């Protein structure tokens, strides 16, 4: 209901496909060696790459550029982790052939990640598959995660919501025409928002586990995660 939602819906979403991962990168998941070193390198190559397109996407969100600039940073540094997660779940659940699902998983398991963090991560990776989310549901959820006023180091959180709320209502509108036999779908998607938080907690520890054993990052990643 209300295209004025669709003036931004479709608009949200040629932003979403506008860039995929370069296959100079994604075809290294196959062409290169399988060591905990190379495993970690590719993941870095891919997360860093994914930060770049993420920024591009975020900038094209209605009213984001209009925001305080001390918050535009805070929005990204807290949600980048979780946004990465969403876009790879998409990759694994739909089992997209450009993401190389079955192989990408194994690079991750031997990347020096504690099995303590490995496990709940694929508990999710599956968990989000059965929802069989549409791209609009993967896209809107990604924009909503970015536009999250509950992150840390935000001064004007009210303005952030003034831009999240439409896309929420657009999302809310969506789960009543695609799937109507169950009204409770819209707030099962919203539960994944909280699981990602639970993972954003675990991830900061994966980071230190890595930085501890000498695993290094890009200046971009080292900056978005300090």
């Amino acid at each position: 209901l209300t295209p004025d939602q669709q003036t931004l819906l479709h608009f949200i979403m040629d932003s979403y496909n506008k860039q995929r991962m370069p296959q100079e990168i994604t075809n290294k998941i196959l062409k290169e060696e399988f060591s905990a070193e190379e495993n970690f390198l590719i993941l870095t190559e891919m997360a860093t790459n994914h930060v770049q397109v993420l920024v591009e996407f975020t900038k094209k969100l209605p009213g984001f550029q209009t925001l305080d600039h001390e918050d535009q940073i805070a929005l990204l540094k807290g949600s980048a982790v979780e946004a990465m997660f969403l876009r790879s779940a998409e990759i694994f659940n739909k089992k997209l052939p450009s993401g190389h699902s079955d192989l990408l998983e194994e690079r991750i398991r031997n990347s020096g990640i504690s099995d303590e963090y490995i496990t709940p991560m694929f508990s999710f990776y599956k968990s989000i598959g059965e929802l069989k989310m549409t791209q609009e549901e993967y896209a809107l959820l990604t924009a909503i995660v970015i536009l999250s006023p509950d992150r840390q180091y935000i001064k004007d959180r009210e303005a952030v919501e003034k831009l999240q709320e439409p896309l929420l209502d657009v999302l809310q509108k969506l789960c009543k025409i695609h799937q109507p036999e169950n009204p409770q779908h819209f707030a099962c998607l919203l539960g994944r928002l909280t699981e990602l938080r639970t993972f954003n907690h675990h991830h900061a520890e994966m980071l230190m586990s890595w930085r501890v054993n000498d695993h290094k990052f890009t200046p971009l990643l080292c900056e978005i995660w300090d």
């Binding site: 600039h69 940073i73 200046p219 900056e223």
Partner: peptide, 11 residues
């Protein structure tokens, strides 16, 4: 501090 991020938002 946090200036690599600002160059991607102004492109």
């Amino acid at each position: 501090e946090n200036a690599l991020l600002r160059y991607l938002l102004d492109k």
